[PDB]
Structure 1
Amino acid sequence: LKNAKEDAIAELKKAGITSDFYFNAINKAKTVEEVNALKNEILKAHA
């Protein structure tokens, strides 16, 4: 049950942040909360 993870990555692509390194990070994240935290950090980093 990690659909929020792939949605996070898709949403990240939608934002325009195109780097597989971040996708590896998000996929390495053990929990959905980690996924969201990562996505938010990445977002703030390239916002």
Structure 2
Amino acid sequence: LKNAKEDAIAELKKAGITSDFXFNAXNKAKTVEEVNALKNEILKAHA
């Protein structure tokens, strides 16, 4: 958990996502499922 979430935030920052509500919702995610959900959601929006 304390790995996928960090790499998630790094992935978002590298992708070009300046979303505080993104980073917080990264930290708020407690399961890999949620992490993928948040990333996919905002990345889909960003793309």
Contact 1:8 1:39 in 2 (8 A): yes
Q: Is the 8 A contact 1:2 1:32 kept in 2?
A: no
CA apart distance, 1:23: 0.5
Cα deviation for residue 4 of structure 1 reads 0.7
- In the superposition, the TM-score normalised over structure 2's length comes to 0.85
Runs of 4+ aligned structure 1 residues displaced above 6 Å come to none
Shift of 1:38: 0.8
- Paired-residue identity, %: 96
Offset from partner CA, 1:1-47 (integer Å, 9 cap, x none): 32011101100010001122110012111211111111010100111
Q: Distance in 2 between matches of 1:22 and 1:12?
A: 8
CA RMSD of aligned residues (A): 1.0
> Does residue 1:21 correspond to 2:9, yes or no?
no
Q: Which runs of 5+ in 2 are unaligned?
A: none
Q: Which runs of 5+ in 1 are unaligned?
A: none
CA distance in 1, matches of 2:30, 2:4: 12
